[PDB]
Design a protein around this ligand. Structure first.
Ligand SMILES: O=C(O)[C@@H](CO)OP(=O)(O)O
Ligand SMILES: O=C(O)[C@@H](CO)OP(=O)(O)O
Ligand SMILES: [Mg+2]
Ligand SMILES: [Mg+2]
Ligand SMILES: [Mg+2]
Lengths: 437, 414
């Protein structure tokens, strides 16, 4: 029985406020914290900010917090809902607001309750959270599938100061045989990368971006990728580490074209790329580098560019801003053959149940699903249990630096230990971890 | 009763392995993670040695003193080098968490009980936020390690963290505007990391940030010079990361004169490790007229023998408390109690290699010290402690006070 629902303001990993929810039951007090994006898609569910210029430069969440305490909490408590019935929980929360994008109460008001309810339910059931989430999503558990971590070891775009337009350069240790192996050897590549970046581009190029990646002041995707391959090799892991990109191309889409110098206000417009031109750039990288995944290669409503590119792509293509973890937009993407993997960000849609549905829809279409952090993250480790429960085979949750990133990666170590012989590491089958064995 | 003790390797905030210990009781599983400034062996020493011995012993976890005497006597080396201070600390800390859950109390209330502190009001600390990172914590020229802001003028902890975060965000934007976008990227403890060569440059930004954010008069400054890191051939190299010109290295009185000029221009209320770690004379000399809090870190390395020496020699007036240096909770408490007894302050501190563990947040409250440093308000190995303090302040309502301008003697406040 839920006796109390309570929200407070706490700080994310960028030092900006966000919403934390505690739900109290007979089993104790369950806490969940809402993350926050920087490269948010225009179609995301509403993140409610106070806009009081006198406090946190307008970025307060006291209104969202108030909506939990004054509106969601009494309704929830009075309703006497079975927290084990997540669909009931989320149907109820969704009905409190009654707008598709949660504009009345805020996605950041609703989500903390949704997540905390799932934590309470697992406790009531005496099971680890990942087991409960497998139950909610009707996923296979014999074996569980541990994910390949896509580690964002060099940050650019909206996540780091510097000229580099592409947002994320990730290594993926698909050749590892365990999750603990994958994390160890990924951490070794990262340390090599930091040393080498500081040898090449100066000591300050080793300071980190928002997601813990090194942030050299470079201009080209090729210079980022040459550095990463040098680190893969120097660490002794050639052949066992692949690369993923998140272009976050919506961040640099202007007036039908793509500005690869978008953080320079005097960027030369005659150098901006058309869709076809950016596709040629991708194909070039794909041919020269061990790239096995590309995320948001085109902008969030540039559907024809996605569809055209996908036709000849033949590696994993991940929809992030295109789909906003929204079953409606995923349906359109599947119809158009725009991509073949979903980036699952629970706070884009705002409930656990809608997120599970979006994963289930993706799998049903033969798509992969990469569970993801936000660039504004917290000590919360929910997504570690989520990507195991959903059996997806792949997570991105930061470089192996900054503890809003390691908190999830350490939790994955703990889950792998607990599972023992009842889990397998997805390795080279990451795209379809859900069908493995 | 403790039914199980288990350790494993996890990653710290720089991506380096560290020790995590879990203690299982009837109340649940209690986890402690050790910070860092060998891991395989430490984990094995927990699983093969401490774990069977501790479980067999059936020690009362609420009796922290017995827990820690058991652990020290099991190790049997003064410096805990037989089993590893990291192996020992994980079990020490986790025992305290198990003890709180048994008592049905928050951890800080339990730690106040352990240290026999006043709970009349509890004292929330001033956060010394390391907003600009230099020295060994950041790539760049800047020699001094930490440039902290201390919101001593806030009325609550919540306020302090809010206005501190506003200053930090203003700093980042001023720094990117003035030194280029790359300069706004962060060092190990979350501070911005401009490639600058002098403390005046760094301190200039901070004062501008304080002003741009609207908080002049309410934000003071603390420094961690970590001078030992650039103490070479009897002199101080303020270009130690660069071959630095040997003719520009400063003597102690030249370094002391540097500090006085900073102290005049800037609202500095604390300086840590202004001199090298075995230069007692320089410390003792500087202190006689310093007129502000002087914090001992490398000087004392949370060791009771060197702490007693520092008190006697009157080398400083505050101890930096790093639990991982001394290796048990009981000894840390004793260290802070000896400090208070001498009329010193105690600043509870993180390590540059931190984790998601929030122990030091509960510790700073339980010890009633009035001051903590646990990073910039960026990177969640720092925010996790700062967030934990928000929760504590909120929970305590009228039963808590912010140390504010009394941070030096927080333990005596109300
Ligand atoms: O773009 C992404 O997929 C995410 C996390 O890397 O970034 P943000 O949180 O800024 O949208
Ligand atoms: O010098 C210090 O006070 C600490 C904390 O900032 O740093 P480190 O953990 O690197 O010793
Ligand atoms: Mg993305
Ligand atoms: Mg120090
Ligand atoms: Mg005051």
């Amino acid at each position: 029985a839920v006796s109390k629902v309570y929200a407070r303001s706490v700080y994310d990993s960028r030092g900006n406020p966000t919403v934390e929810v505690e739900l109290t039951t007979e089993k104790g007090v369950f806490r969940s914290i809402v993350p926050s994006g920087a490269a948010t898609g225009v179609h995301e569910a509403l993140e409610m900010r106070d806009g009081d210029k006198s406090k946190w430069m307008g970025k307060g969440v006291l209104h969202a917090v108030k909506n939990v305490n004054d509106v969601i909490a009494p309704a929830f408590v009075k309703a006497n809902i079975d927290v084990k019935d997540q669909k009931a929980v989320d149907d109820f929360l969704i009905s409190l607001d009654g707008t598709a994008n949660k504009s009345k109460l805020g996605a950041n008001a609703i989500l903390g309750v949704s997540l905390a309810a799932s934590r309470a339910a697992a406790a009531e059931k005496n099971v680890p959270l990942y087991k409960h989430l497998a139950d909610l999503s009707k996923s296979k558990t014999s074996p569980y599938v541990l994910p390949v971590p896509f580690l964002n070891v060099l940050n650019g775009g909206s996540h780091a100061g510097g000229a580099l337009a592409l947002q994320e350069f990730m290594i993926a240790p698909t050749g590892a045989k365990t999750f603990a192996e994958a994390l160890r050897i990924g951490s070794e590549v990262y340390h090599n990368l930091k040393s080498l970046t500081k040898k090449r581009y100066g000591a300050s190029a080793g300071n980190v971006g928002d997601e813990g990646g090194v942030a050299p002041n470079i201009q080209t995707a090729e210079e980022a990728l040459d550095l990463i391959v040098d680190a893969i090799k120097a660490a002794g892991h050639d052949g066992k580490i692949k690369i993923g990109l998140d272009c976050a191309s919506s961040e640099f889409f202007k007036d039908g074209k793509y500005d690869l110098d978008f953080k320079n206000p005097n960027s030369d417009k005659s150098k901006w790329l058309t869709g076809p031109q950016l596709a040629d750039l991708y194909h070039s990288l794909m041919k020269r580098y061990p790239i096995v995944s590309i995320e948001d290669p085109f902008a969030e409503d540039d559907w024809e560019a996605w569809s055209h590119f996908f036709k000849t792509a033949g590696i994993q293509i991940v929809a992030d801003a295109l789909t906003v973890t929204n079953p409606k937009r995923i349906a359109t993407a599947i119809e158009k053959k725009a991509a073949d993997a979903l980036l699952l960000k629970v706070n884009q849609i705002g409930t656990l149940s809608e997120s599970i549905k979006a994963a289930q829809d993706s799998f049903a279409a033969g798509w992969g699903v990469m569970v993801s952090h936000r660039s504004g993250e917290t000590e919360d480790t929910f997504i570690a249990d989520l990507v195991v429960g959903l059996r997806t085979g792949q997570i991105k949750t930061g470089a192996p630096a900054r503890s809003e990133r390691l908190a999830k990666l350490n939790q994955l170590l703990r889950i792998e230990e607990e599972l023992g012989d009842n889990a397998v590491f997805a390795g080279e089958n990451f795209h379809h971890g859900d069908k493995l064995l």
